[PDB]
Design a protein around this ligand. Structure first.
Ligand code: Q1Z
Ligand code: MN
Lengths: 18, 429
């Protein structure tokens, strides 16, 4: 689930550590 | 304040404190080795094991190392494996394990840890709430909803659970139902409720149902620092970038890109029309719940700075043309896509996620009447072969009340005031 046009996901970025 | 020492650890409290002293003084390497020594000599000590884990955690911060952190994550688990672990220490250790697993993106791992935590501390509401967040972070909204329903069946006025339950309702398009939860949750002031996502979605839910008070929530959300302004409500920002709803080509500095789009617009048009005629499944329905009614689909060539190679087979000349323009093809917080909208469509007022991009629209097939776009307090129209540019972190709204289809080409670019350094570093959206 990606935030393309809106802000509908709980988080829009991906977690990849440091 | 927390009781971290079991019977045996009290008997070695002086060695344990000596090791912890080293860590708080920032001598991490000496501290790691001190706790390793303690672990060797007392391999059943929960406090020694946790100390080893905490040093590894600090060391991972020092070295900014995921591999070292994975080591800490396992050591936090070892603490829980040991005999006779005090409850406060068990909870601290497994909580930290889950938090660091999420930081690494091991969301399924975190979820198992959180399920363990809830099994171990069945009366701890905060941990059930944390479990719901674990489910939300892997996209499992069905399970998250069940979690907050359980929390609310026992503590009906838990504000964290309310705002999260409202968030989920809103995401399922249960607009009216979500409003009281979002609003009561925020008003609770409970920890975790003063978050821009909940102001954002309460105001939006209110707008959709015609509630005049939406902007009071936007105003409060701006007062509390979540929104750059009442009109610009994105949540993934670089502070300081110039904020304007409408931009001219010259203001952006991407004049060569605008010239190429306008000089070559008919080839871009024609490939879109060919896909509409012969490959219509490449156009995919908008799926972020942004339509009140009607039909709106997009055919995406780049997303997150990555070319879709199958899609570009359908618009090969357009993709070739755009490759000369890294300000859009390497915009990892925007897209490049065709956008078709048909009569009878109304797109809800909405905001994009980030102020780090600007959005270009090139008109391709624009009916003479019935189509318009508002950004903040100004409405405009499209023209065939002409580019409009707006900042879609500002609230914007679109109508399609023509008697035939309307096709545009959308090209996102990095906000011009972002340095090459930020453009390489910001995480993709
Ligand atoms: C509705 C518009 C797209 C369009 O008019 O096709 C929009 O929200 C956006 O470009 O960000
Ligand atoms: Mn939009």
């Amino acid at each position: 689930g990606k935030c393309k046009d809106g802000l509908g996901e709980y988080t829009c970025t991906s977690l990849e550590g440091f | 304040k927390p009781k971290l020492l079991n019977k045996f650890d009290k008997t070695i409290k002086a060695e344990l404190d000596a090791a912890e002293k080293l860590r708080k003084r920032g001598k991490i390497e000496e501290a790691v080795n001190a706790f390793k020594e303690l672990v060797r000599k007392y391999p059943q000590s929960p406090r020694a094991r946790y100390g080893k884990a905490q040093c590894e955690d600090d060391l991972a911060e020092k070295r900014r190392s995921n591999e070292v952190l994975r080591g800490a994550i396992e050591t936090y688990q070892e603490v829980a494996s040991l005999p006779d672990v005090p409850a406060d220490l068990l909870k601290l250790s497994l909580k930290r394990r889950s938090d660091r697993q999420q930081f690494l993106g091991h969301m399924r791992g975190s979820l198992l840890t959180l399920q363990r935590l809830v099994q171990l501390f069945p009366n701890d509401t905060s941990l059930k709430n944390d479990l719901g967040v674990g489910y939300l972070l892997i996209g499992d909204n069905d399970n998250a909803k069940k979690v907050y329903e359980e929390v609310l069946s026992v503590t009906p006025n838990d504000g964290f659970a309310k705002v999260h339950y409202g968030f989920i309702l809103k995401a399922q398009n249960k607009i009216a139902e979500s409003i009281p939860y979002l609003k009561e949750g925020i008003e609770s002031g409970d920890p975790g409720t003063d978050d821009g996502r909940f102001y954002f979605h309460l105001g939006d839910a209110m707008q959709r149902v015609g509630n005049k008070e939406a902007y009071k929530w936007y105003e409060l959300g701006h007062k509390r620092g979540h929104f750059a302004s009442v009109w610009q409500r994105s949540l993934y920002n670089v502070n300081g970038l110039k904020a304007q709803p409408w931009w001219t080509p010259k203001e952006t500095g991407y004049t060569e890109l605008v010239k190429s789009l306008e000089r070559n617009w008919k080839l871009i048009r024609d490939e879109g029309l060919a896909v509409m005629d012969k490959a219509k499944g490449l156009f995919l329905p908008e799926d972020e719940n942004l339509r009140e009614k009607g039909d709106w689909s997009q055919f995406t060539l780049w997303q997150q700075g990555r070319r879709n190679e199958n899609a570009c087979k359908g618009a090969p000349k357009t993709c070739t043309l755009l490759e000369k323009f890294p300000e859009t093809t390497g915009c990892r917080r925007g897209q490049i896509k065709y956008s078709i909208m048909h009569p009878g469509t109304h797109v809800w007022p909405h905001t994009g996620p980030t102020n780090c991009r600007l959005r270009m629209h090139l008109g391709l097939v624009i009916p003479k009447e019935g189509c318009k776009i508002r950004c903040a307090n100004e409405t405009k129209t499209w023209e065939e072969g002409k580019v409009l540019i707006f900042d879609d972190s500002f609230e914007h709204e679109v109508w399609q009340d023509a008697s035939s289809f309307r096709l545009i080409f959308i090209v996102d670019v990095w906000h011009p005031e972002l340095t090459p350094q930020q453009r390489r570093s910001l995480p993709a959206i």
